[PDB]
C-alpha cells in the first residue's frame, strides 16, 4: 500500500463530483478551454487578425462575439505564449490570436479527458464502455474540422472561429468554395443527425403511449419504480401498432437501442471523412458530364447548374472582406451580377 | 487429420438480410451518380 | 451524356459483390437446423 495506491483511493472516492485519474487531465483542460472562450468573447478583439470586432467590450452581442483565428501570416504556428511570435507578452499574445490555439488544443486534450472519464467510471461501476465508444464520433468531428482541415490549407485562419455568427460564416464558406452540400459524405452525415432525431422522437413517443397502468393518477410519471422487474410499457402492443401503420416494426429491445447508437454515430464519422478530403480541396464540386454538354448547349439548365452560379456569387462578393491578407481589389465591372439586382 | 477445436458456424437471419440488402442498395443509389460523373 | 465508361461495371459490382455475400450467408443459415 504505497503512495500510489493511497492516491488511487482519494481519486476514486465516491463524492459529489467524481475526480479519478482522468480528472487530472480533464478538469484543467476543460476549465481553461471554457474560461478561455469566456475571456475572449468578453474582452479580446479581432482587429489585427481579421479587421473585426468580436467582444462585448467593443459592442458585439451574444450572436456576434467570437474568438477568431490567427492571421494567415501566422501559418500553422502553435502560438505559444513563450513562443517566438508573442515573446512572452500577454497583450500581444491576445492580439495575434493566441487564444484560438489556446482553446483549440486545451479543448482537444479536454475531450480526451472526458472520454477517459467514461472508460474510468464504466469499469468501476461494472458496465460495458459503449457510452465511451459513442463519444468517438464527436471527437472525430472536432479533430477533422478544427485541426485536420486548417492543417491541410494554408493556416489556422481558415479554421472555424469560436462564435455563433462565425460558425455561420463557416457554413456559407463551404457552400461557395467547396460545394459541401453536394458531397455524398455530408449527405450520409445529414441522414445520421436527422435519422437520429427521428428515432429519438419516435422511441420516446412510442414508450409514453404504450405504458401499463401501474398507478391511479392521471399524471402517469410516478407509476414507475427503478427497482421494478417488469417492463413499464408493452413491447407487444407497440410492435403491432407500427407493423400495421408503417409496415415494419421492432421486436427486440436490445437491437432497438443499439440501432439508436449506430445511426447518429455512423453519420458523424462519415461527415468527418468528408472534410478530411476538403483539407486537400478534394471536393465533390462538379459533374463532368453535366458541364461538358452545358458548355456547348446554351439551353441546358438544371437545378445543379443554378447552384454553381450562386457559389460564384458567394466567392466574388465575400472574398475581399473574408480574406483581407490577399488584398483583393475587385472593381464594380467584374462582379458577377444578374439583371437589375 | 483431427478436426480443429476452434470452429463455429455462421448465421444470418432474414431481418439482417433485408437490412443488409437495403444498406447496399441505397448506398449504390447514392454513389452511382458520382461513379458515372 | 458523356459519363464514365466504367461507372456501369463499378456500379454493377458495387451491388452484386456484397449482395451475394449476404445471400450466401442467409441461405446456408436457413439450411441448417
Amino acid at each position: 500500500r504505497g503512495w500510489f495506491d493511497i492516491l488511487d483511493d482519494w481519486l476514486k472516492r465516491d463524492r459529489f463530483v467524481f475526480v479519478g485519474w482522468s480528472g487530472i487531465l480533464l478538469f484543467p483542460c476543460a476549465y481553461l478551454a471554457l474560461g478561455g472562450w469566456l475571456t475572449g468573447t468578453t474582452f479580446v478583439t479581432s482587429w489585427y487578425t481579421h479587421g473585426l470586432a468580436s467582444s462585448y467590450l467593443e459592442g458585439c452581442n451574444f450572436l456576434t462575439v467570437a474568438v477568431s483565428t490567427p492571421a494567415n501570416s501566422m501559418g500553422h504556428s502553435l502560438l505559444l505564449l513563450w513562443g517566438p511570435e508573442a515573446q512572452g507578452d500577454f497583450t500581444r499574445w491576445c492580439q495575434l490570436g493566441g487564444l484560438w490555439t489556446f482553446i483549440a488544443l486545451h479543448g482537444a486534450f479536454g475531450l480526451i479527458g472526458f472520454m477517459l472519464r467514461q472508460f474510468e467510471i464504466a469499469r468501476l461501476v461494472g458496465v460495458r464502455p459503449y457510452n465511451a465508444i459513442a463519444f468517438s464520433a464527436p471527437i472525430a468531428v472536432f479533430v477533422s474540422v478544427f485541426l485536420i482541415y486548417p492543417l491541410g490549407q494554408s493556416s489556422w485562419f481558415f479554421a472555424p472561429s469560436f462564435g455563433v455568427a462565425a460558425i455561420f460564416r463557416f457554413l456559407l464558406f463551404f457552400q461557395g468554395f467547396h460545394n459541401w452540400t453536394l458531397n455524398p459524405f455530408h449527405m450520409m452525415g445529414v441522414a445520421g443527425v436527422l435519422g437520429g432525431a427521428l428515432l429519438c422522437a419516435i422511441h420516446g413517443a412510442t414508450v409514453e403511449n404504450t405504458l401499463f397502468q401501474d398507478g391511479e393518477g392521471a399524471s402517469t410519471f410516478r407509476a414507475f419504480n427503478p427497482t421494478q422487474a417488469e417492463e413499464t410499457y408493452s413491447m407487444v402492443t407497440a410492435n403491432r401498432f407500427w407493423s400495421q401503420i408503417f409496415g415494419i416494426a421492432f421486436s427486440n429491445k436490445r437491437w432497438l437501442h443499439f440501432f439508436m447508437l449506430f445511426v447518429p454515430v455512423t453519420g458523424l464519422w462519415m461527415s468527418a471523412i468528408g472534410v478530411v478530403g476538403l483539407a486537400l480541396n478534394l471536393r465533390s464540386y462538379d459533374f463532368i458530364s453535366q458541364e461538358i454538354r452545358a458548355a456547348e448547349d446554351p439551353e441546358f439548365e438544371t437545378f445543379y447548374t443554378k447552384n454553381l452560379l450562386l457559389n460564384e456569387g458567394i466567392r466574388a462578393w465575400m472574398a475581399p472582406q473574408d480574406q483581407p491578407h490577399e488584398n483583393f481589389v475587385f472593381p464594380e465591372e467584374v462582379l458577377p451580377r444578374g439583371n437589375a439586382l | 487429420m483431427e478436426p480443429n477445436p476452434n470452429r463455429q458456424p455462421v448465421e444470418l437471419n432474414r431481418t439482417s438480410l433485408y437490412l443488409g440488402l437495403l444498406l447496399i442498395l441505397v448506398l449504390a443509389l447514392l454513389f452511382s451518380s458520382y461513379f458515372f460523373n | 451524356m458523356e459519363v464514365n465508361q466504367l461507372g456501369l461495371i463499378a456500379t454493377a459490382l458495387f451491388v452484386l459483390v456484397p449482395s451475394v455475400f449476404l445471400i450466401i450467408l442467409y441461405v446456408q443459415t436457413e439450411s441448417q437446423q
Binding site: V236, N239, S243, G247, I248, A249, S251 | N13, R14, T15, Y18, L21, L22, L25, V26, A28, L29, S32, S33, F36 | M1, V3, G7, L8, T11, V15
Partner: peptide
Amino acid sequence: METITYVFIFACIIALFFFAIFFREPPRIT
C-alpha cells in the same frame, strides 16, 4: 445506360419493400 441503371436500382428497393413487409420473419411470443 445511366437512366436504366438508376431505374433498376430504384425498382429493386421497391421490390425489397414488398418482401420485407409481407414475407418478414413472423413476430412470435413465447
